[PDB]
């Protein structure tokens, strides 16, 4: 019955695989990427009219009827996003008259204008001279002098925030302005009567930092700042040492863009670091069939590859399938063998992790590492020496990453400080990298493949962790995936792999929760609003990935041969396309709960296959 | 009469000009470049058998009958060079038997073997495990902690030595060893009875440094070295910040090669700086028609271009010649506009100099700057705004570079410390960059084109400088050109340009000196031995360049219409080739008096043209 669905899905994945043997689907986000890029170009004075065009199409193409832009397809209009997209268009050419501009300008005003945008947005606008720098939360270069065990040293921040700060300090240190031609000045972003509803720090703001900031803007005005030069150079050097191989920084849009600006600021446009960082951009860009052009927030080659492999293996293909070997080999060449920022906390830990993207050695992550190591563990490669060796190196690296609570973060160990979450500057996304349920689940699911059960202390410390985090309704939060369906699926699936009894009370309380949210159409769906409004937990239009997720929780919990179970399987089998693929007009990936969402292109194809492959095991 | 010679010579230079509008002749040195490269490859574990071949032919091709290699064509066999070339060949394949090997081996032994080679040679051999590191002069990473005004801080060294030291500290800090396959081990470099005649420090060795070194090799043995990590990183950063645009480091073979090794040491082979630095090498390499391959010590695009222009202008071509405009424009794009290491002494001086090579922003030199600015001053470019502006920036930069004695160094101001010249490590070439007569001459010759005469204090301070340096016989030393013929020509030519009276006593005493060394063939020649043995001052086989030099001194001194004068002109006119060029099987360029010599490929063509062009002015 469902078989045909598999054979079609399988042959589809293999058709998407690149020559080198890996998979790599685009990563969708929102239009701030492309908008900030446009500004970056203006800043660096490298504007290509042809690109500006492809970029204008995209922006318009992503604009909804109301004339706004959201963070995810079918999401509430976002102010920040829309503001940035607005300025971008006006620069490219658009006149404040054009209906599209009109609608957006009104939405923006009805919200309180620029005065209500996130720090970043205001900062960018500050960079082009459309906003006072004084009203921008200050982050000083001197921050570079904080020791390893002090309040607010750069290592109290999550990896992604860290580099961003380092880069910015240099920028905010000079507070440079790159004038926009009159033709695009946007004073109209001020023209508003509505009260400027401002967003505060993430976990609240203590009058302390609030004062401190005021102090910094004051000190920033003096004629002489002792050791500032040294602070800056410290920052610059920190950047030059960590520049990724593809010329980026962390393989992420934010710090990368800032670093470049910072270098421009220091007249190092003719320095290797800058040149490479500049040309490396093209790799993250993407041509759109409808003429548009988009820039990726990041790239998921490794990630996509790892999953694709597990899906195909769980599906049916032989452990030694020649096509799955290209992958295996490719993955082995990817393993990072040098100390990254993580070494700051684990100086005696041997390198052995993997990164999300192609070449990012200083920031391998636990999630990627776990999936890769586990994927390889299911293959029979030619060189059993390197396969045996690599798995062991990664395995021990993961074990040495486990945080205090027995959980697993993404990039660092016990990066659970709270200080950063109160700074005036941090009003967007996460700023720290504490352990999460989903990353942890994947890790256990990995060890489980080797056989390590609940007997091993490391496993116990982790299980206890999850057990304490489980939500009242028996659900599990989804940190890097939308959302409870994502997390719960991961957890139940993992706990089943480490030997735990699938009959347990808290376990059953989780499976019930799943069946209870199965949409009429037989599938499962969870909208990104579930991060803002609890009423959306497990509620949303059914999607291929999210369905496969809830499906895995059921198959793992033993309820494989259930109604709701067979029901879902029907959904996937039907909704499948003629080519063997699947569609998913919704985001199921999470960047920052409630602030930044992602659209993983391979999910719609990989997970459904993995889900089916396991349902085929259950029979 | 001579006219035809010019027309031929002129059309020749115009034929060698590249499309972009610049000239660029290869720079010849000795085989240590190619030999160290081979080792570099072995170190970095990137050996291309096809390249090794091209390199073998070269090495053999440059070996003389006796089975040795010298520093210049027709020069005494050099031990260091030969030793390195020897090891190189043995690695490539050669067996210690092969006649070429046998002859070299014996020469090496008759000299005391490896124990008599310069520090560098022994160090390289140390790197591959064929020599004890303990016997290698120690240069610690900690040197990075010396303040700007302290004994032996990195800024007391000449630019070229500085970077070399910084790179090495990191290396000597780890004292790594990269084993050679048994097949190429060279213990036979020890098999000798002759006493190990060792070379000491440049300006002598005080028992202090001698003991200090011993101290270091001892401290180097301890189990813990406090702040060493910080010392290394200081070095690494210093290197990362200064890496040239073409991925080199100063546009010179030494530091470039070491930096790469140092990076390899720190497992940064997957870092942009390393990658770019690695691929940058190919640009300095050269394919030889006879199948060989050579690596340039540096590249002289700018330099060649500047001179070629002056030669052609002095010859006859219009100041607005479309072909000379390509050059002018190209040169304008070359001007450096950012602070280089020189800024450490002149923080208030505005950037405006030029570099020897294509892209080396942190090390513009006075010589290049003077020639370029002066060359432009003789052109009529389309954008008189940038030509007027540029010349001004360069002019002021040069002025702000004049050292204390009124003289001009090459890269720094008053870089005349003496401490460095006594270190155990510095036993090869120069280690400081004090003002020289030749660089100074070119500078005056430059201002002179604008009109600034002896009235201006700057000029006076410089003239007095030269006047005090002039040798007893009325000759002038040649720092960057072989030798007294080179210097004297430059000086007399310059002094004539700044208004000084060509009838003066010391002046006439210089011209007489020239005429007194004119070879029978009617030309002038000065062998590189004139740096070692005074009996060779103005003695040696006549060459096209050196002749044109002595010729310029005569034309400038007023004795243009002389016997010796017209005599030389005859030489050039005759020795000229059918194509309009000239040959020169001898080196007329100086890298380090008595230690390193260069072969400037364009000299044979440019100077003869310039000399004639001026003799045509004298009529
Ligand atoms: C499960 C997969 C592996 N996982 C491990 C990697 C997936 C995350 C990478 C994509 C997210 O990229 C980012 C990463 C960081 C940011 C920031 C940001 C926010 C606050 C500060 Br302070 C600095 C930057 N803004 N935006 C859009 C960002 C986008
Ligand atoms: C007149 C032209 C402009 N002039 C201004 C530049 C010409 C000089 C550049 C070629 C010489 O390049 C070098 C420059 C430096 C070195 C060293 C060296 C010597 C001692 C130490 Br300590 C470190 C390096 N070894 N070798 C072969 C070297 C070769
Ligand atoms: C990173 C601080 C930027 C300010 C430095 C520019 C001012 C000049 O400093 C004096 C000496 O430094 C000159 C060296 O050039 C080396 C490259 O290092 C990069 C930034 O200058
Ligand atoms: C300069 C020390 C070289 C010794 C290698 C050990 C590396 C330890 O680095 C400290 C940990 O921080 C890791 C950060 O990423 C930066 C890498 O810089 C590269 C060379 O150290």
Coordinates of C-alpha atoms and ligand atoms in Angstrom, one line a residue, chain A residues 27 29-30 32-33 118 120 157 160-162 164-165 168 251-255 258 297-299 303 356-357 365-368 410-411 425-426 428-431 438-439 442 480 486 590-592 596 598 600 603, ligand 1:
Chain A
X27 CA 17.3 27.7 3.9
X29 CA 13.9 32.9 6.4
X30 CA 12.5 36.5 5.9
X32 CA 15.6 41.3 6.3
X33 CA 18.5 39.2 4.8
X118 CA 14.2 46.3 17.1
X120 CA 19.2 46.1 14.8
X157 CA 27.1 34.9 25.1
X160 CA 26.1 33.4 17.3
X161 CA 25.7 36.5 19.5
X162 CA 29.4 36.6 20.5
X164 CA 28.1 39.8 16.4
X165 CA 29.0 41.8 19.4
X168 CA 29.8 45.7 16.4
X251 CA 28.4 30.7 8.4
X252 CA 25.7 33.1 9.4
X253 CA 24.4 36.4 7.9
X254 CA 24.6 38.7 11.0
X255 CA 28.3 38.7 12.2
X258 CA 29.0 43.4 10.5
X297 CA 20.7 33.2 6.6
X298 CA 22.9 30.1 6.7
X299 CA 23.4 26.9 4.7
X303 CA 22.6 18.7 8.2
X356 CA 26.1 22.9 10.1
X357 CA 27.6 24.3 6.9
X365 CA 27.5 21.9 16.9
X366 CA 26.2 19.0 19.0
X367 CA 23.1 18.5 16.9
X368 CA 24.9 18.1 13.6
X410 CA 24.1 23.5 20.6
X411 CA 27.6 25.1 20.6
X425 CA 21.1 45.8 23.0
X426 CA 19.7 42.3 23.2
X428 CA 15.9 40.1 19.4
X429 CA 16.2 36.4 19.5
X430 CA 18.3 34.3 22.0
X431 CA 21.6 35.5 23.3
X438 CA 15.5 18.5 21.2
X439 CA 19.3 18.6 20.8
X442 CA 19.0 13.5 19.1
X480 CA 15.1 24.2 16.8
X486 CA 8.9 18.4 16.7
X590 CA 12.8 27.4 14.5
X591 CA 15.7 29.9 14.7
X592 CA 14.6 31.9 17.8
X596 CA 13.2 34.2 13.8
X598 CA 13.3 29.0 9.2
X600 CA 14.0 23.8 5.8
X603 CA 12.2 18.4 5.6
Ligands
LIG1 C1 19.4 22.0 14.0 C2 20.4 22.5 13.2 C3 21.7 22.9 13.6 N1 21.7 24.2 14.3 C4 22.7 24.2 15.4 C5 22.0 25.4 13.4 C6 20.7 26.1 12.9 C7 20.8 27.7 13.2 C8 21.5 28.5 12.1 C9 20.5 29.5 11.4 C10 20.2 30.7 12.2 O1 21.1 31.8 11.8 C11 21.1 32.9 12.6 C12 21.9 33.1 13.7 C13 21.9 34.2 14.6 C14 21.1 35.3 14.2 C15 20.7 36.6 14.7 C16 21.3 37.3 15.9 C17 20.5 37.6 17.0 C18 21.0 38.2 18.2 C19 22.4 38.6 18.2 BR1 23.1 39.4 19.7 C20 23.2 38.3 17.1 C21 22.7 37.6 15.9 N2 19.8 37.1 13.8 N3 19.5 36.3 12.9 C22 18.5 36.6 11.9 C23 20.2 35.2 13.1 C24 20.2 34.0 12.2

